[PDB]
């Protein structure tokens, strides 16, 4: 059928007009196939023969479908498409299972010839006119234009999805407890009624559907849940990711490790505590897809962990709207966070992981906060509601980190949970200078051409030291010089520096860094008992600024 | 009648994806919008419209009523020729000198003029559904939308017509329009002021229209120099950096006589005396900072920037400028609460002052993680415009060179 629905007006982009592409000549039998096809289609309304006053043309080919010897008609809308207006993005964003409400009975119905079942806008049909070439191309070809939405045209998925929504509107409104999902030419029908009441409202959906040009699989064939969908396995009561088998190989290529890292990542939606840091380490570097990568001990270890985590099945529950979401996060490794989301412990609606580093340096507190944000947004999308959090951090630790920290921040209602490791701050810098502690006016420097550097310090107690570094930058020397001061000083030290770069880093109280230097400065800072870091304006001519500026 | 409206040469409509909204705001939005539609203010639209701007709900202030709010930042940017350099609303340089300024919402007026039909497709927005389970509801505007800088521009004609008599009858009263808001100021005693507002709303009320600023009581936050009994080397080093930075702003700032005392390698904790030359150079700057930056002027062709530091204990400093360090204005703002709530309030505060003073919204450098701000700001937002913002870590030094 051709749905009786109204059409969507469409126009070519503002500059241009329809394509005018010459038809490549086709073998004598490809020509035969196209004629058979278009005669079929023509009798259905899908296409219409046209007088060659119509300027427009688009190429058309016919690939010999499968070994099953039938033919299929392909059209090339490359050019009409390039010249057609942009449409509202079909659906961008996809429903997560964990967001679905539980349902008693579910049915799939598939639309037939979906695209050819929806009308095309009159004023636009003209531009969809193709040509079936004559044998050895000696005479005028037959010419049709589309009446329905052609496959492969730019606006087809948009208009179709829209039409199907316009047609469903009535049913949905007169039945707000039954659930439909439209994914492309699929309709799934969800109900909390019994196998009879449900086949009932299903069968009059179909009736409503045929009243509008759309035919559906008879109540006799052929799909019952479980359903595979977008990678998932939905049952009426629970869901999971669809079966994922991890290979047993003695040799692992880059390509084999990618597909594994991506199957594990997929798994991690519902399988708690999946880790992949060690398998992803391999991929670092530049190597060919076929190059074999030998697994490290830590990576082989990980593969081990993951392999058992998967050995027994796991499923997620569905969402009861009248209960709070609970989100628990655990530290799982360095920069690695895992979380579960549930409503009755511990039957999870979903699990996840987080391992993004922001910047070169952070500490656990920063990272844990960034996962709370991640999880929160995710919550809003999936459930339209933020969860209540349980975090491995004491209220005091987090109250301390924030108040003193210079970026604004705020996490939703949360409460402590004792799930080790716990997040702490590993050192804290003095607020005022320390009486009775040696004062290091330190100072690093680099000659930008040589990239040769000299780092050093002088103290109020007469001490001095200047050492030499090779191919570093001003940045490194300034961090070296502070590192210097920390290894030579005792447990209470005052350090003065003219490096704002360095102050900023350290004042941020890092506890992980990409920089080895910094990771040491850190080691040192945890060993100390009091440390006060001060900044001074370089070259301005300051107490020990100029003094050890002599030494550099 | 409808004023023919067009984008800028080049640019196309806006295509901004809808931010995820909560069940609360969506529900709210679905009401609002089905009522706006069975009133012909907005119409349901097809896929043949590729354009989007983001919408969301607030409840204004202490009010238990949701209000639709549409983020027209992109569209405004993409029409910008029209709403500024053809028709445009002139900014009274006196409004900022007034004893009292009242801000009242005249957005609804727009709802009654029709919008150029060949422009409506650019005002499309989407009501999203939770978990993307169904297709969002899509709408265009038929009338002049709130939030869009076309609307006051299109209504300039009808607005001054409406205020004509009241202006005649109180020639000493200032009324300036910016987007959906009217700014009304005067020097009357607060009571005679408020009375003149009710008189004004009566005028408005004949055409459809059912807080207090005190711009004088706006004064600068000087860079404050600590006054002290003793001084440690540390205390003076602190001092010298802070004067050191002010020099990158205020002409005349001297430093030499002070960093005089930081000689050689002393202990930070070492109390060191205070000589007469320094005691004098100290006071000298003190009055310079007191004063407006000599040399700086507002350029009408240039974006305003505003920057905010977190001070802790509910304090927030901020500065306004067009080229960095050349500060047009500096200030503080202080103190149910919440780091983000405060900032969002501070933003609105600074934005308000910024409109009164220059007729222009600043572009904010926000000291917060992008993703955190986005999740939450729409929760404390009670304004009907939205400034532009970008996020940035605050260099540690700046924070304190501005502390009070
Ligand atoms: C998004 C979505 C995907 C599928 C995808 C189907 C497929 N393949 C099927 C449906 C019916 C829906 N729509 C909704 C909306 C609200 N609750 C539910 N719950 C729900 C859906 C399917 C099963 C099952 N089995 C259980 C509960 N589904």
Swiss-Prot record, chain A:
* Result, substituting residue 119 to S: Confers resistance to lodenosine
Effect in UniProt of substituting residue 219 to R: Confers resistance to lamivudine, stavudine, zalcicabine and zidovudine
Q: What is the effect of changing residue 190 to A?
A: Confers resistance to efavirenz and nevirapine
Q: Where is the motif Tryptophan repeat motif annotated in this sequence?
A: 398-414
Q: Where is this site: Essential for RT p66/p51 heterodimerization?
A: 401, 414
Instruction: State what changing residue 44 to A does.
Output: Confers resistance to lamivudine
Q: Per UniProt, what does mutating residue 188 to H do?
A: Confers resistance to atevirdine, efavirenz, loviride and zidovudine
Recorded consequence of changing residue 67 to G: Confers multi-NRTI resistance
Residues that bind Mg(2+) 2? 443, 478, 498, 549
List the subcellular locations: Virion
Look up what happens after changing residue 181 to C.
Confers multi-NNRTI resistance
Tell me where in this chain the Reverse transcriptase domain is found.
44-234
Note the site residues: Cleavage: 440-441
Substituting residue 88 to S results in: Confers resistance to pyrophosphate analog PFA
Q: What is the effect of changing residue 138 to K?
A: Confers resistance to emivirine
* Result of altering residue 135 to M: Confers resistance to delavirdine, efavirenz and nevirapine
Q: What is the effect of changing residue 68 to Y?
A: Confers multi-NRTI resistance
What changing residue 74 to I does, per the record, is: Confers resistance to HBY 097
Domain of life assignment: Viruses
Q: So what does mutating residue 333 to E actually do? A: Confers resistance to abacavir, lamivudine and zidovudine
* Protein's job: Multifunctional enzyme that converts the viral RNA genome into dsDNA in the cytoplasm, shortly after virus entry into the cell. This enzyme displays a DNA polymerase activity that can copy either DNA or RNA templates, and a ribonuclease H (RNase H) activity that cleaves the RNA strand of RNA-DNA heteroduplexes in a partially processive 3' to 5' endonucleasic mode. Conversion of viral genomic RNA into dsDNA requires many steps. A tRNA(3)-Lys binds to the primer-binding site (PBS) situated at the 5'-end of the viral RNA.
* Protein name from the UniProt record: Reverse transcriptase/ribonuclease H
Organism equals Human immunodeficiency virus type 1 group M subtype B (isolate HXB2) (HIV-1)
